[PDB]
From Swiss-Prot, chain B:
Inhibited by methyl methanethiosulfonate, phenylglyoxal, tetranitromethane and diethyl pyrocarbonate. Inhibited by 4-oxo-1,4-dihydro-quinoline-3,7-dicarboxylic acid, 4-(benzo[d][1,3]dioxol-5-ylamino)-4-oxobutanoic acid and 1,4-diaminonaphthalene-2,6-disulfonic acid. Keywords: Catecholamine biosynthesis, Methyltransferase, Phosphoprotein, S-adenosyl-L-methionine, Transferase. This is Phenylethanolamine N-methyltransferase. Belongs to the class I-like SAM-binding methyltransferase superfamily. NNMT/PNMT/TEMT family. Octopamine binds at residues 196, 244. Pathway: Catecholamine biosynthesis; (R)-adrenaline biosynthesis; (R)-adrenaline from (R)-noradrenaline: step 1/1.
Length: 268, 257
């Protein structure tokens, strides 16, 4: 059917997206509380760390899809890829990453996440080295639209196809419905080499979330709907985990019921 | 002992616990080595009990980071009032407190239990019951009727004895004095400078008795200890900074018999 209308609503809504409110909502306490191991923050970092610790996810290049203003999702990844591409639809997010990349004071402070990543990776790495290395390995920050058949545009700067994809809380957060979600997943898959890996983190059964003035509409998906899409896009699912959001972390910034983590390998 | 009246805690903290000696990122540095010695020792599970006294804490807390989860009642001590105030500022989260968070983070890193550094600090602050005056040159270092529970199940002392003693014999007596605070069977974790004769703390120029690993060992034996472990870190050139003339650092794990 028609994708333009729904997508247009999505683009319109996001023009009001406030990175600082989003950061506050999802990455400052209580959700940003890395001290409780039962919290969502540690669960996120744990999924990534353990996945990369298998040694099975490696290569030269990685593309992070819909990075927004966050970098936690690359902390464990950055030791396994020489070349990392970050991306976002919104200029204000790309600028936010720009501040962190220049190590400015005004930048969001990710050091708790960096340290925690060092803690659970168990190699006694200090967090300053971790951060220095991610900053070195991020080779570009690009505009992206996952609804386009070529999400990075034509003749993009990105090394293609990539050995690996990371995407956290993007697809479900920018797709009006499941069909759109599936197509988004189809589009980003054209960027991954056959046999490459996709690490997909996202919200389960979420219909809305706030980022300042902007209230955004999210397609609520289930674990089984996420599995089907991955199969439908040509992936073998290696791992699919579910975190049930505790009530004390359900804060009125959204209606998220849980979080999913998928490690999928593109068939070919 | 009057020289210690000019001892500036911030200058000392700058000299030993800020970069380069303060950089914890390089595993071959003295900071990580010290934390490593403490952690490994406690990780054995052979150093346990209810009460612990830290001897000559100065204005530093790193020496108890790994210890605090093994002892519910902790006593910190120093000869100088200014050092006791500097400790108070960190314990009470006051303004101007020295930031020990790098060390707390590194202890959590080394200990490998998944603990966030804030929990670590929280526990340490909670278990430190009291900060007391002390003088190891006195037969009763803590004085007559101290608030400290005695005898302690364990002692810790870092860079104190050799730094307050003019010579080996004074060093030996100082050790005899603090040994009286320790329950028989108790454990002593002693960390200290090797072959050092002076160091600076702002306007203060302190004298140090230069001691060897073999001298340290013999002293512990003379005081009634069985040396369970004794290691040396040789101070690399890049950490020899004009603040002192230290050659190495010794770590000793001893058990009172
Ligand atoms: N059409 C589109 N194509 C690709 N990314 C988009 C998009 N529309 C919005 N986005 C980005 O999708 C993100 C959802 S928030 C996720 C932020 C980050 N990945 C983290 O894990 O929190 C926002 O940064 C938003 O700007
Ligand atoms: N006569 C005495 N008896 C017990 N402690 C003394 C003393 N004279 C000086 N001290 C304290 O011995 C300490 C030596 S340096 C501080 C060592 C600190 N524990 C750390 O590990 O870096 C100083 O705090 C000093 O004030
Ligand atoms: Cl933990 C969580 N829940 C809902 N939305 C999110 N976006 C990023 N993290 C999120
Ligand atoms: Cl590493 C080191 N060297 C000399 N004196 C010291 N006091 C505390 N740490 C010290």
């Amino acid at each position: 059917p028609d994708s333009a209308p729904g997508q247009a609503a999505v683009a319109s809504a996001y023009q009001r997206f406030e990175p600082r409110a989003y950061l506050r909502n999802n990455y400052a306490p209580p959700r940003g509380d890395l001290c409780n191991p039962n919290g969502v923050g540690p669960w996120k970092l744990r999924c990534l760390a353990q996945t990369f610790a298998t040694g099975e996810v490696s290569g030269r290049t990685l593309i992070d899809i819909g990075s927004g203003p966050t970098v936690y999702q690359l902390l464990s990844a950055c030791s396994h890829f020489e070349d990392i591409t970050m991306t976002d639809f919104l200029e204000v997010n790309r600028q936010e990453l720009g501040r962190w990349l220049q190590e400015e004071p005004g930048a969001f402070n990710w050091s708790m996440y960096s340290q925690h990543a060092c803690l659970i990776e168990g190699k006694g790495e200090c967090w300053q080295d971790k951060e220095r290395q991610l900053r070195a390995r991020v080779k570009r920050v690009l505009p992206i639209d996952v609804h386009q058949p070529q999400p990075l545009g034509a003749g993009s700067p990105a090394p293609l196809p990539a050995d690996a994809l990371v995407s956290a809380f993007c697809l479900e957060a920018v797709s009006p419905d499941l069909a759109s979600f599936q197509r988004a997943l189809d589009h980003i898959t054209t960027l991954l080499r056959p046999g490459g890996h996709l690490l997909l983190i996202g919200a389960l059964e979420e219909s809305w979330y706030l980022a300042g003035e902007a209230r955004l509409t999210v397609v609520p998906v289930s674990e089984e709907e996420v599995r089907e899409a991955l199969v439908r896009s040509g992936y073998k699912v290696r791992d699919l985990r579910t975190y049930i959001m505790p009530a004390h972390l359900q804060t009125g910034v959204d209606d998220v019921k849980g979080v999913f983590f998928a490690w999928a390998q593109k068939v070919g």
